[PDB]
């Protein structure tokens, strides 16, 4: 067989696929990544709204702006969550 050398930088994160939707914008969990930190914790689910990150509101901003705020963080991040935010 063909033998190649592949170097990967692991994706470090909470294990969450997010989407922004509307009235102000809101950040919702599209999917919880299998085996990721959010999945092992067991509290988060698809459809939940991420209201904030470390005291900073996640309302009225784009997916990219929410991602900038949620990745800027240290190893440990605190989320305020509205269970099934589609209320």
């Amino acid at each position: 067989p063909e033998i190649i050398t592949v170097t990967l930088k692991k994706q470090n994160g909470m294990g969450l696929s997010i989407v922004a939707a509307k009235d102000k914008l809101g950040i919702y969990v599209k999917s919880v990544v299998k085996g990721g930190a959010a999945d092992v914790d067991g509290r988060l689910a698809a459809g939940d709204q991420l209201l904030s990150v470390d005291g900073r509101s996640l309302v009225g901003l784009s997916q990219e702006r929410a991602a900038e705020l949620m990745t800027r963080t240290s190893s440990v991040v605190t989320l305020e969550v509205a269970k099934q935010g589609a209320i």
């Binding site: 994706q11 994160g13 909470m14 969450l16 696929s17 997010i18 989407v19 599209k30 999917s31 990544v33 997916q63 990219e64 929410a66 991602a67 949620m70 990745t71």
Partner: peptide, 5 residues
């Protein structure tokens, strides 16, 4: 369109 965080 979606992102990973």
């Amino acid at each position: 369109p979606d992102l990973l965080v």
